[PDB]
Design a protein around this ligand. Structure first.
Ligand SMILES: *[C@@H]1O[C@H](CO[C@@H]2O[C@@H](C)[C@@H](O)[C@@H](O)[C@@H]2O)[C@@H](O[C@@H]2O[C@H](CO)[C@@H](O[C@@H]3O[C@H](CO)[C@@H](O)[C@H](O)[C@@H]3O)[C@H](O)[C@H]2NC(C)=O)[C@H](O)[C@H]1NC(C)=O
Ligand SMILES: *[C@@H]1O[C@H](CO[C@@H]2O[C@@H](C)[C@@H](O)[C@@H](O)[C@@H]2O)[C@@H](O[C@@H]2O[C@H](CO)[C@@H](O[C@@H]3O[C@H](CO)[C@@H](O)[C@H](O)[C@@H]3O)[C@H](O)[C@H]2NC(C)=O)[C@H](O)[C@H]1NC(C)=O
Lengths: 439, 439
């Protein structure tokens, strides 16, 4: 028997679905999402890391001008400085006083640190949804791990589960993301081969091991101080280091819908967005024939206490006369009231307790305790605690879910005004009918 | 100088773009797409292959009944056949005649061939476009390899190229594809864990080396022939082998827009879809000053022959007076006519020869050479050949592109009728003005 139901994508909140298969005693399955993962498909664009500026020892010609040679190195710069008379610890380096010329050169290489310290620039396309579902089946807890794209069937205890597709394609990840050691950011990183100095992606490579490096640090060689050999330069500070200080909050801190973000692989977990359809194929052996089930008659529901405290604060006691010893599934007939127990045991003339959660001011609801139904009603009190550390187990209320006392007042007021109108309307109708009787 | 142009997404067809930078001689860059690749990002769903049915030697018990326990193997089946009296070459196996029972069991597992012969069920999301472009930069042929997503700047001879994004997101691949070898199919393969017997996907695994195997072959054990030791069974033949015979045409042969399909990795190549924006950052060194360039005067154009073939039929002879020896760009001022040569050499008082193609019955166009325009005119003949094995070098014909003789006829006819109306209208206007001159 194939049963199709839909639950909210909210994680950690159990939902109950009634499987009503004619000829068999009603079955109730409790399903809870333990984990929902949206794993984006990524394509690496480039690696950003700290750059190393390489400055080979300067070449000094005591007499005669040095010549520059072009090189293909990532950001090669070379300049000749005439009129230089450098000193070493033991005295002037050159015999020549004025004809001395220095050749300075420098280039940029990706640092050895880039092997472990780097940010990866990725493009995200679509997400592969995956979910772990806890199901109470035949009274046992079975965990179903399946892809939530609607195309993965998982069979446990001969029950086949289809999960998804997701009702929402929403993902916390943007088209372009940057990943740094567990921290994922949504940013429009600059195009490969066209990065800018002092900004993220100033030095770029396609892979951490690639020797193909783009660099735009605008390295400029300056004239050495008189009497010295050092090679001064002006260069934009690594955009990677600046980014690390200016990263801002990561997606696990900024994402909507309470999404948890993790890396290796990049994952968005437990995003409370949309619904997740579930289809369960339940084998005939799993069902108990109606005639083989206890029949419950002479039922009466009493509700000794009710508080709409979001944690099954309500308790109801149901008296019953069971035809025989056995088990019966319990289901609420209204969405407004959720019952914690999926099944109870029945025997003879006795009573059972059920814990329930509702937002209702007045808990008017019906309960199916096996094959028969009983009507429950109560006045529910508010909680004293303003804040809790858990999501409500009950659903929200509509405008029609006001209290019984409030409804009585509304009916009396509405009826009072409606009666005045109905009477005034009748008087006018009679007068008009008379007015047309005098034509 | 940043020049932004759009090249139609056609491979093997050269396009001319004019770079007009004030103060410098006009430059023409010839661009040709050599290869355009759309590479879909894939996520493997499962592997299918030919299955092996494993049948262990049958267990025969003599005076006694055999029994077995259920196993977790992918499609395990076990049955006990009573009343068996098997013979071997030397006589009956059991001393007992009727008390004998045979225990037959079998299961389905991936064959040893699945490591080599298999089909991969992939999910295709979006494609990363890339292209190889030929550019006639500075009179030389420069090959640019770049991603075509608006990213990946490529610098060649100090000229920086940005390619894309593509004007069309269209791809030949559906969201579900199946890859066998060099063939890719747009197949809506069945959900994992829920394949059907005798059909593709009857046996499934997540990876070629995975021990996680789903199988649905309807393997049913049959009673053995009397006196014979064997385990007969009814099983649906491999759906993989059936699929191989029923594969049909692959996307390589069925895809629209002339798309070429290849695998390892999966690629769609040279699809004639939409267009591809190109932005070129051209260094000032690449431009020649107007004063340094040759200046042409006293230009005239004649066309010894013209045929409006898809090839470069039609030759224009242009006479010129050049102030200096040198070279300059040649550009057509009309889209209707394309000139094969991008640049020519000019000297003194001489003539230049260029080839062009057009769909025009009457070729009327202006040619800009060294910033001087000359007007050409010709009567073009139709081609004798009906079909060629190459795409037209010229653009399409507009509704306004009518021959000069035909245009003359239209003007004479339209003018003649318009004149009759204008005269008739004048007569009526005069009569009405007279009518209103009464009283
Ligand atoms: C099926 O599982 C549910 C939920 O239990 C959770 O999921 C399971 C698969 C396991 O991973 C559990 O470790 C995990 O908690 C079971 O219901 C839960 O039972 C536990 C006791 O085992 C309850 O803990 C206590 O409950 C009392 C109630 O008065 C509290 O006072 C205690 O402070 C403490 O919380 C837990 O609350 C309860 N959860 C719910 C929603 O009812 C369920 O019993 C199990 N069924 C079977 C047959 O295993
Ligand atoms: C720049 O490149 C173009 C195009 O050439 C193509 O791309 C190059 C990068 C190379 O890969 C070439 O192998 C490739 O074809 C050159 O124009 C082409 O020149 C060739 C001759 O070298 C022409 O082939 C001839 O065409 C005539 C036509 O009548 C035939 O009779 C000959 O037998 C022969 O096939 C080719 O047609 C022509 N292509 C076009 C569109 O005109 C170009 O010369 C080159 N320039 C430089 C400086 O290298």
């Amino acid at each position: 028997y194939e049963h199709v139901t839909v639950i909210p994508n909210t994680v950690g909140v159990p939902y109950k679905t009634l499987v009503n298969r004619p000829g068999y005693s009603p079955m109730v399955l409790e399903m809870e999402l333990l984990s929902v993962t949206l794993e984006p498909t990524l394509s690496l664009d480039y690696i950003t890391c700290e750059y190393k500026t390489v400055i080979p020892s300067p070449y000094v010609k005591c007499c005669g001008t040095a010549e520059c040679k072009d090189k293909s190195l990532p950001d090669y710069s070379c300049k000749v400085f005439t009129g230089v008379y450098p000193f070493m610890w033991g005295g002037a380096y050159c015999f020549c006083d004025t004809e001395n010329t220095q050749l300075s050169e420098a280039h940029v290489e990706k640092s050895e640190s880039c092997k472990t310290e780097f940010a990866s620039a990725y493009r995200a396309h679509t997400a592969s949804a995956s979910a772990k579902l806890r199901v109470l089946y035949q009274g046992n807890n079975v965990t179903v791990s399946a892809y939530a794209n609607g195309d993965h069937a998982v069979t446990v205890k001969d029950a086949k589960f289809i999960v998804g597709p997701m009702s929402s394609a929403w993902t916390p990840f943007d088209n372009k993301i940057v990943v740094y050691k567990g921290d994922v950011y949504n940013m429009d990183y600059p195009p490969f081969g066209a990065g800018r100095p002092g900004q993220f992606g100033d030095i770029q490579s396609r892979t951490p091991e690639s020797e193909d490096v783009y660099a735009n640090t605008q390295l400029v060689l300056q004239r050495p101080s008189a009497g010295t050999v050092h090679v001064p330069y002006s260069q934009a500070p690594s955009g990677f280091k600046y980014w690390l200080k200016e990263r801002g909050a990561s997606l696990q801190h900024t994402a909507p819908f309470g999404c948890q973000i993790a890396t290796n692989p990049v994952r968005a977990m437990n995003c409370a967005v949309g619904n997740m359809p579930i289809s369960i194929d339940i084998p005939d052996a799993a069902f108990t024939r109606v005639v083989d089930a206890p029949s419950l008659t002479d039922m009466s529901c009493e509700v000794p206490a009710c508080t709409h405290s979001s944690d099954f604060g309500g308790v109801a006691i149901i008296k019953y006369a069971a035809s025989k010893k056995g088990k019966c599934a319990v289901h609420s007939m209204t969405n407004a009231v959720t019952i914690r127990e999926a099944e109870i045991e029945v025997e003879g003339n006795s009573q059972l307790q059920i814990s329930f959660s509702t937002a209702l001011a007045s808990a008017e609801f019906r309960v199916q305790v096996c094959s028969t139904q009983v009507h429950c009603a109560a006045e529910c009190h508010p909680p004293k605690d303003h804040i809790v550390n858990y999501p409500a187990s009950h659903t929200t209320l509509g405008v029609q879910d006001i209290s019984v006392t409030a409804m009585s007042w509304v009916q009396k007021i509405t009826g009072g005004v409606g009666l005045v109108v109905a009477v005034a309307a009748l008087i006018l109708i009679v007068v008009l009918c008379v007015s047309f009787s005098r034509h």
